[PDB]
């Protein structure tokens, strides 16, 4: 996918096809599926005598062949399907019979010993492919976040809840769906979460129109919405209806692919905004807040495009698009002014091991004033704030430093410190292996690492921040006598503040350092550092509208002293099986 048009447009296109530079040589009995739940599609080979895969990395390279630790003999069985029945986000291997299911849990390196799960009561499950007059598929039609086993026929929709581990509940009838039953053909039944909500809707294709039944939260279907096809297009058994968020809108669009001697495609957009988001607030006292959202995939495309203009190869570490807040607008009625906050996000990421979103490694905020007409000659320029945060994935966190504003005379920047609580000391540690590196780095997630503030004026020093703030975090290992993960604690050990006021030279700068802390994170020893003024460089970089010799007259000796404020402290802790009181102050010097 590519950004179409200028950066900031919401248009999406695709580039000229190019061969991938590298692909797996083994493409026999293989398919492209995610079997680890990493977000990386795996070219998975299950051939005669060989089981393994090549995972597609986010930078475009592939891993080497990785053997599976264990694959079921039945993997290749004609009724084999993959579905999440464990409720783990992984695709498990399952065979469905009418009274039982054979389930092999996905253990993320191979599969578990298969178990036969017998269904309770008199529950009888549909077996997909058993009857050409109806559709049987795994989909979420209740909006619970689990695929359920669903049977769709001309007269009714029946759902069997997924209770986990192959157990199914009693069938639920979801009323409202109905076709002529002579004209009913399961081939024409498509499922999608078109409104961006929990449950999946049902689309029935008729040759000249789409019959869309919205899913009323698992309690049946809404009356069908009929969308006529554009003139000249008719749907048939050769035509494909696809449903995908090709536009990054958070919702699928309907795509009609028709290969009739010359493939052509049509797309229906039902919305350009995700429906169920808070959109407005009005407090009836003149304050009106409007929210807008933009998906993370559109921010990615802008990032991608920007890289092209600089010859760089960006990597998206976030396979799962999310809707972030963008263009928050506050209108002050009575007054007539508008305040607009624009956010821009970049470099966000998905964990892949804990299957969670880590956050964005970068957030950029603008702050603009649209003053009421007639009030001013465009006074009050907009501001810009750049914020860098740890994602805890040190492929991003390490890259973020090149985006920082450069001051050639700056103090050395920060890097995270890792320690272990050893004989009650904050002892430095270099993580022993990759598991520790993972657990330690993730403990940094969400920490603000740097913040820069700029005014967006029309001056000559508009590219110099007013302020810069830097932080250094630390992660301490407190306990690892457990399952593989450690108990970790983290805080900011150092914080550095620069004040440039848009003058690149002669900044003020100070730093707060916690030299030592207790087992409960209390600041046993702290230091505040006030750094001296730089010794008067040759080039002023001041407005030079100043009184004669003012700059010379602005230098003094107090400004050249290094100040270290040093404070000792102690606290009481009442810790027993019945009492827990921490941090009661005792003393300080």
């Amino acid at each position: 996918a590519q950004r179409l048009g200028e950066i900031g447009s919401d248009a999406v296109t695709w580039e000229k096809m190019q061969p991938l530079s590298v692909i797996p040589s083994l493409q026999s009995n293989a398919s492209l599926v995610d079997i680890n739940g990493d977000g990386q599609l795996d070219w998975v080979i299950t051939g005669p005598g060989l089981r393994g895969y090549h995972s597609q990395r986010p930078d475009g390279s592939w891993t080497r062949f990785t053997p599976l630790n264990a694959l079921p003999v039945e993997y290749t069985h004609p009724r084999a399907q993959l579905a999440d029945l464990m409720g783990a986000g992984l695709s498990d291997l399952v065979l469905i019979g009418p009274k039982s299911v054979r389930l092999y849990a996905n253990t993320r390196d191979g599969f578990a010993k298969g178990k036969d799960v017998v269904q309770s009561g008199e529950i009888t499950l549909p077996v997909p492919g058993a009857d050409p007059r109806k559709l049987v598929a795994f989909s979420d039609v209740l909006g619970s976040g689990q695929a359920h086993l669903v049977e769709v026929s001309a007269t009714k929709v029946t759902c069997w809840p997924n209770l986990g581990r192959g157990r199914f509940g009693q069938p639920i009838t979801l009323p409202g769906f109905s076709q002529p039953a002579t004209e009913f053909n399961p081939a024409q039944v498509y499922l999608a979460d078109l409104d961006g909500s929990g449950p999946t809707d049902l689309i029935y294709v008729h040759t000249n129109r789409l019959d869309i039944f919205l899913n009323k939260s698992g309690n049946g279907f809404a009356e069908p919405v009929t969308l006529r096809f554009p003139e000249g297009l008719r749907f048939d058994h050769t035509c494909q209806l696809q449903m995908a968020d090709v536009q990054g809108l958070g919702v699928a669009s309907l795509i009609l692919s028709v290969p009739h001697m010359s493939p052509h495609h049509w797309r229906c957009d039902l919305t350009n905004m995700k429906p169920w988001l808070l959109n407005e607030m009005n407090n009836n006292m003149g304050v009106h807040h409007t929210l807008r959202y933009r998906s993370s995939s559109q921010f990615w495309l802008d990032e991608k495009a920007a890289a092209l203009t600089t010859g760089q190869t960006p990597v998206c570490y976030l396979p799962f698009p999310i809707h972030t807040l963008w263009q928050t607008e506050t209108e002050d009625e009575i007054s007539g002014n508008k305040l607009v906050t624009t956010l821009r996000y970049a470099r966000g990421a998905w964990d892949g091991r804990e299957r969670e979103f880590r956050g964005f490694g970068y957030v950029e905020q603008t702050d603009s004033h649209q003053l009421a007409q007639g009030n001013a000659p465009e006074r009050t320029p907009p501001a810009l704030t750049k914020n860098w945060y740890a994602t805890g994935l040190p492929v991003i966190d390490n890259a973020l430093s090149t985006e920082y504003w450069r001051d050639d005379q700056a103090f050395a920047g920060f890097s995270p410190r890792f320690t272990t609580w050893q004989d009650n000391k904050d002892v430095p540690l270099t993580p022993e292996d990759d598991n520790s590196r993972y657990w330690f780095n993730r403990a940094l997630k969400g920490q603000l690492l740097r913040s820069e503030l700029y005014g967006l004026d029309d001056s000559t020093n508009k590219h110099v921040p007013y302020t810069v703030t830097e932080f250094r975090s630390q992660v301490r290992r407190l306990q690892h006598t457990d399952s593989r993960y450690p108990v970790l604690w983290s805080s900011v050990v150092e914080s550095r503040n620069y004040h440039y006021e848009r003058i690149a030279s002669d900044p003020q700068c100070s730093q707060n350092i916690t030299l030592s802390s207790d087992r409960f994170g209390q600041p046993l020893k702290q230091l505040s550092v006030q750094y001296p003024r730089r010794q008067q460089p040759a080039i002023n970089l001041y407005p030079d509208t100043l009184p004669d010799k003012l700059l010379a007259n602005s230098y003094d000796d107090q400004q050249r002293q290094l100040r270290l404020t040093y404070q000792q402290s102690s606290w009481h802790h009442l810790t027993n099986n019945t009492v827990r009181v921490l941090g009661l102050p005792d003393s300080t010097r």
């Binding site: 004609p78 009418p98 054979r102 549909p126 009857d131 007059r133």
Partner: protein
Amino acid sequence: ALLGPYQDVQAILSYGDKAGLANGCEALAVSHGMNDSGQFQLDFNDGKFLPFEGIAIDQGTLTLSFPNASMPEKGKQATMLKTLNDIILHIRYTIK
């Protein structure tokens, strides 16, 4: 019908009238239920007549028989038949 991955169906299809049925083309077994031919392999080129071949398309009667269907006697088809929605014949015929 709802058969599992390792579950069969037992049924016999036969022609109930006078016709030049070959010996062994008089009746056909059904075992898997999915477009199930009366044979382990289907080949229209093996030099042999197929089951029911040569029967006029408009004469006589077909019967499909499910043994062990009765529920009160605990038959085997008895539980599966309660899940059989329809019966579909696929008839290949020729016009000459």
